[PDB]
Amino acid sequence: ALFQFRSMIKCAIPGSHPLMDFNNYGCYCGWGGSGTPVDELDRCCETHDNCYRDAKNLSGCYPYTESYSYSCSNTEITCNSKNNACEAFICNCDRNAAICFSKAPYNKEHKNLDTKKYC
Amino acid sequence: ALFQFRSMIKCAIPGSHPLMDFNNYGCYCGWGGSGTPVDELDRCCETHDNCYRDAKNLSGCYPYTESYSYSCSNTEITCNSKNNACEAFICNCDRNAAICFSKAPYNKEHKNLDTKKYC
Numbered sequence: 295a296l297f298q299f300r301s302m303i304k305c306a307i308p309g310s311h312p313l314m315d316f317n318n319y320g321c322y323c324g325w326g327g328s329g330t331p332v333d334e335l336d337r338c339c340e341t342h343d344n345c346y347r348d349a350k351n352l353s354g355c356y357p358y359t360e361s362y363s364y365s366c367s368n369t370e371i372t373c374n375s376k377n378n379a380c381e382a383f384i385c386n387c388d389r390n391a392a393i394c395f396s397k398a399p400y401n402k403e404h405k406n407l408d409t410k411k412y413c
Numbered sequence: 414a415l416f417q418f419r420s421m422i423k424c425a426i427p428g429s430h431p432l433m434d435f436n437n438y439g440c441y442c443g444w445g446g447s448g449t450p451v452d453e454l455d456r457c458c459e460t461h462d463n464c465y466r467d468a469k470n471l472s473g474c475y476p477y478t479e480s481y482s483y484s485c486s487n488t489e490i491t492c493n494s495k496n497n498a499c500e501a502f503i504c505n506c507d508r509n510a511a512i513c514f515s516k517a518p519y520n521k522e523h524k525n526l527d528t529k530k531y532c
């Protein structure tokens with residue numbers, strides 16, 4: 295679920311403030327997304343968007359509100375192998391996005407980008 | 414989900430082995446259940462069974478496989494207020510049983526009861 299995602303980013307990147315750092319970044323980070331990703335981080339985002347999109351293909355699979363089971367044995371995220379298909383899928387989308395964010399450059403010039411004009 | 418319930422009992426009762434301890438106890442503790450519960454513990458089990466049985470009123474709610482968000486505060490069990498309706502409901506069933514088990518006498522003679530004759 296969305297609340298669990300927030301925490302998972304914290305696991306992977308301990309000194310992050312997910313809502314402040316990751317939301318409203320590039321053309322894709324945050325609710326919605328269009329155009330071409332401005333950079334590496336943005337692409338991380340667009341791939342999560344698309345990951346969620348493939349999920350709404352599992353019957354009754356709603357990514358924003360589907361709670362799964364996961365753990366953090368520090369910086370390392372583990373998706374419970376016991377999650378149902380839907381929960382598993384979504385956990386993967388989230389885990390991947392978290393690791394992707396942790397390994398990508400962060401351009402301050404892309405934070406709160408003018409989407410109507412650069413997207 | 415079932416795997417989470419196992420951990421949920423261990424939390425309310427640290428020295429327990431839920432699967433070896435409560436499964437196949439009385440008339441109701443384990444898959445299925447019938448007759449009149451032989452004891453207090455047995456009564457905790459019937460109640461959990463019927464809690465689940467109700468869950469199947471909510472749309473697309475599968476008690477055995479729906480994973481929720483919860484945590485163990487050192488004995489104390491907390492179901493995340495962020496759970497969706499189906500998750501929250503199932504979390505509660507589970508939490509109430511764990512607490513129930515905590516408080517009920519355990520009768521070793523009620524273990525592996527001859528169901529076919531006593532239930």
Ligand SMILES: CCCCCCCCCCCC(=O)N[C@H](CCCC)COP(=O)(O)OCCO
Pocket residue numbers: 296297299300303312313316317322323324325326327338339340342343344346347391
């Ligand atoms: C909610 C707080 C959790 C942490 C958020 C911080 C960064 C989120 C950006 C990641 C990509 C994105 O925009 N993913 C979204 C989820 C985040 C919503 C704000 C996918 O959902 P979106 O509807 O944009 O795409 C779905 C359709 O494909």
Ligand SMILES: CCCCCCCCCCCC(=O)N[C@H](CCCC)COP(=O)(O)OCCO
Pocket residue numbers: 415416418419431432435436441442443444445446457458459461462463465466510
């Ligand atoms: C299996 C996971 C770890 C095992 C924990 C030990 C069993 C504890 C039983 C508690 C009551 C019960 O019987 N509750 C059950 C589920 C747990 C045992 C399978 C309700 O499920 P049941 O199908 O009996 O009833 C369904 C609705 O009537």
Ligand SMILES: [Ca+2]
Pocket residue numbers: 322323324325326327339343
């Ligand atoms: Ca998005």
Ligand SMILES: [Ca+2]
Pocket residue numbers: 360361362381479480481500
């Ligand atoms: Ca769930």
Ligand SMILES: [Ca+2]
Pocket residue numbers: 441442443444445446458462
């Ligand atoms: Ca039962």
